Amino acid sequence: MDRPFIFINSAMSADGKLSTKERKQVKISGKLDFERMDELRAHADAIMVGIGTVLADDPSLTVKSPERKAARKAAGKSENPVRVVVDSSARTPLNADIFKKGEGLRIIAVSNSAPEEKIRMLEEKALVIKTGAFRVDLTELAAKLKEMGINSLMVEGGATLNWGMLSAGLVDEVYTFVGNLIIGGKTAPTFTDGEGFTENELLGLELSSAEKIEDGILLKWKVK
């Protein structure tokens, strides 16, 4: 039933893309947005990313600033927030950067269809939470994260995970750093891919703030 406070933070091009048509990472935001993202990571209890992001970018999801890591450790918490990968078939690579880098809890959320052999290998390095049939049940995952002490969850994204979280009615706020470039492309990942809403299913927002940061602009939206 219950869930953490959940927000999406992503950086997108002016035409709404998270990455190119080849699924390759480009520089959307500068140092100042990277510092803001690091502050968010430091204050969040957990960070969540989809398997698509892990496979494309192999990110570590760590807090980068030594001062922020020390501030978290001084307050009793691990240097990094809990890192959560949403991954139905348990395909998270065993030598992924989320496993090589930093201290803290890792969680792989898999589906009940996931093969047992891969689940066991991952369980050496992470807590594995099983929900749903062929796909992770994000509502049940969310309540299970809240049960464990997670009150603040940052969805770092993935176009499809963003869709999954938003269409399930789980998100409280959306942060979009809009960068000063056009990426383009029909098949380029956008801020929200997945199936998409029809005319009668559209999700209303309210604009909370708009702040210019370096060469782009940060839009913060409250979900209705």
Ligand X SMILES: NC(=O)c1ccc[n+]([C@@H]2O[C@H](COP(=O)([O-])OP(=O)(O)OC[C@H]3O[C@@H](n4cnc5c(N)ncnc54)[C@H](OP(=O)(O)O)[C@@H]3O)[C@@H](O)[C@H]2O)c1
Tell me how far apart the alpha carbons of residues 163 and 7 are, in angstroms, rounded to a whole number: 13
CB of 208 to ligand X, least distance (A): 19
Distances (CA, A) of 199 to 30, 196, 204: 36, 10, 12
159 touching ligand X, by CB under 6 A? yes
Query: For residues 90 and 150, which CB has a smaller minimum distance to ligand X in the complex?
Result: 90
Q: How far apart are CB 209 and ligand X at their closest, in Å?
A: 19
Region of 61-69, 85-93, 122-130, 211-219 interacting with ligand X (CB under 6 A): 85-93
Q: Does 91 bind ligand X (CB under 6 A)?
A: yes
Give the H or E element holding residue 145.
helix 138-147
Is the Cβ of residue 32 or residue 219 nearer to its own copies in the bound state?
219
Cα separation of 161 and 135, whole Å?
11
- Binding-residue pattern over the window 182 to 211 for ligand X, x denoting contact by CB under 6 A: -------x---x------------------
Cα–Cα distance, 99 to 11 (Å, whole number):
24
Distance CA 81, CA 118 (A): 24
Strand partners, 194: none
Task: Point out which residues bind its own copies (CB under 8 A).
Answer: 12, 14-17, 20-22, 24, 26, 159-160, 162-163, 166-167, 174, 176, 178, 180-188, 190-199, 202-207, 210, 212, 215-217, 219, 221
Residue 10 makes contact with ligand X by CB under 6 A = yes
Check residue 92 for interaction with ligand X (CB under 6 A).
no
The answer to the question of whether 135 is labelled as a binding residue is yes
Q: In what order do the strands lie in the sheet with 152-157?
A: 127-131, 106-111, 82-86, 46-50, 152-157, 5-12, 173-178, 216-223
Give the CA distances from residue 220 to residues 30, 144, 151, 176, in Å, rounded to whole numbers and listed in that order.
18, 27, 20, 6
- Which residues are annotated binding-site positions for NADP(+)? 11, 18-19, 23, 50, 52-53, 57, 88, 91, 135-136, 159-161
Residues near ligand X (CB under 6 A): 10-11, 18-19, 23, 25, 28, 49-53, 56-57, 86-89, 91, 135-136, 138, 156-161, 164, 189, 193
